[PDB]
Design a protein around this ligand. Structure first.
Ligand SMILES: O=C(NC[C@H]1CCCCN1)c1cc(OCC(F)(F)F)ccc1OCC(F)(F)F
Lengths: 209, 214, 211, 213
């Protein structure tokens, strides 16, 4: 019993996993090259199953070693799903290259120390969706009639507005043609770009605290 | 009188306000989809009048409870106007009725703080912003009598001189979209525009720092 | 001397100058509309001439009242030159609109704002000079690398400058410049991608240096 | 020991800066084709003198400094930029890097460099995350959109450039993401979150930089 617990939390075992991680990453970085998957595709498709096989064992062990304690450690928890994904018979399997974040304790803090920023802002983030929701409704029934590729859908109003938010081709690509049919659209968007922009500065400042 | 005053400042009423918001939001969030408004549009268009009816009441009561204190409290004040817009049957207002889904910010005491904590920046910046508009005004005049003769779509009007210059501020398509064609007729437009990008940029950065300190 | 000295330093006079500024400002904002200058050009073309006369007088008084003390006050200095520009009887005809900046000078609330931001400039001259050489070294490389086939972008050292600043600003840097370049010189992702890195990394750290 | 006194003189320190600015300015006309027509031969020789003379300073300082020399970064760097210049057209272009040595002689710049380079270590925990994050994502696209959009995502390396471009937000939507949505209408599930994480990272870098120095 306790004999197994010593194998898991050993430096050897953990270090061994991280080696396979770095390796299986390189394996997926050659599954891209058509030339490679031609000559060595057979070599790889099995080699991957070996890895996800070993990772199945470890995650099973990690469960028996931790029992109910396991499904409260996110990194440990997260690792579980990412293999289940890898189990299901194709692109989302590459998420298992995130365990290199989990398996390395130097990263876990960085992720957490940056997710620690998320809560002090959800009061702001939640506001935006409401702000976006009303506007996406306005546009889709304002400009949605003549510019449907941009505003034909409520959701389509989202993508264009978040783009205009990012300031990519907001003027030449969206606002200028809009102003050829609705010449006052410069009253809709110029403030919206200000309103949304004002948020970002005060956030950055609020976080430097 | 005071009997209603207990209903008004009840948590139910406070909680209730936030409820109707969410429904009319979702209801207006289906007033967008053409598909929905076919079978249930009339049922919906009336539901808004139902909504816009009830919303008349709250602001009526809340005023008598607050009297002159009401028309000095911003959050409550705002609440009123959004109904008058919603009250008017120039369709635009029928579209502008959708602002009534903004009141969910007012009723939530967690939100007002969020809003308030950001407006405190304007006074430490109103000294700057007013400078910016003046800066634009002097410059917007320069272009309109410089490039306005051959580029009327971009600089033909002062208002168009504004829009084009305010765009270059954002750096969106400023070079290939604006300055490069300018340099085909007036090869020095980079003397107008390259510095203008500096000052305008330094202001906004120096503004952020002024906010970073406070 | 002392007889005039009471007119100069009055609050009234200060208030009076700012009136013509705001007046000449809004007045200068309609000299753009072609329609007006036909029906009202004489009213306007002269009103400018009226003002620039008065400001010539004031600047004469302000000089004699302060004498050598005048030519050490920045705000005072600028105001003078902007009238000299305005004095010359077609580029300058546009540069006359700079006289709408004196509203910054006459208002003591502005002078602080401008200066307190020019007060940041010295703490950055150590940084800025590095970039120019960095910019200068690179413009030489491109102009003799890609300048042969891309003359609109890199035919001249100065043209390499404009492209680099433009690339530095991130406007159409990739699709407009780097992508077509990589169709003839497939390694242009080695020239510019670092230039985007170094230049960008500086600006963040600079704001931080000021923050 | 006779030469050693010349090197660390204030004259000599200043003296290097003379040839830099001159060779810098001289290369600013080796660039202009117009000048190099009438003065090219006049120009081509001045460089060889400099690239010869510039060898000496780094030669002397080494015997003066010995093993102390190859532990001072600025001292180290100075050599390679000359060694590059020595090898007899990319190299002929890379010779112009020799105008960087002006950084060595001037102590006012190094402080900015050092005081800024200092904020690069406390973040490598973040940057390496980004490279991995890009790596996972660059793989996803390249086998997602690589089939129909190869100039943008046909190769992992091409996914890099396209993703690093979208990071800067240059023509990411109209130029890259919007056409993607005509065949794969779900590319906004790949790209919209990717836009969030990468952006949030850059902010957090700032926070780390705000605090550090
Ligand atoms: O703002 C950004 N671009 C818009 C501005 C900048 C100038 C061009 C157009 N205007 C921006 C740029 C970034 O480049 C990161 C680097 F690639 F350098 F690493 C990262 C995050 C950004 O922020 C996005 C936000 F905040 F706008 F949403």
């Amino acid at each position: 019993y306790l004999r197994i617990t010593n194998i898991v939390e050993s430096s050897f075992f953990t270090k061994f996993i991280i080696y396979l991680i770095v390796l299986n990453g390189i394996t997926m970085g050659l599954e891209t090259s058509k030339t490679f998957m031609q000559s060595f595709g057979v070599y790889t498709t099995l080699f991957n199953q070996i890895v996800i096989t070993i990772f199945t064992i470890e995650i099973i062990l990690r469960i028996y070693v931790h029992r109910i304690s396991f499904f409260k450690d996110p990194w440990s928890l997260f690792d579980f799903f990412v293999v289940a994904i890898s189990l299901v018979p194709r692109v989302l399997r590459v998420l298992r290259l995130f365990r290199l974040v989990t398996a390395v304790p130097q990263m876990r803090k960085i992720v957490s120390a940056l997710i620690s920023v998320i809560p002090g802002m959800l009061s702001v983030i939640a506001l935006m969706t409401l702000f976006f929701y009303i506007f996406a409704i306005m546009a889709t029934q304002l400009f949605g009639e003549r510019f449907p590729e941009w505003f034909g859908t409520l959701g389509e109003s989202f993508y264009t507005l978040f783009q205009v938010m990012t300031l990519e081709s907001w003027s030449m690509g969206i606002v200028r043609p809009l102003m050829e049919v609705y010449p006052y659209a410069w009253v809709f968007f110029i403030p919206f770009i200000f309103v949304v922009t004002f948020v970002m500065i005060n956030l950055v400042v609020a976080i430097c605290v």
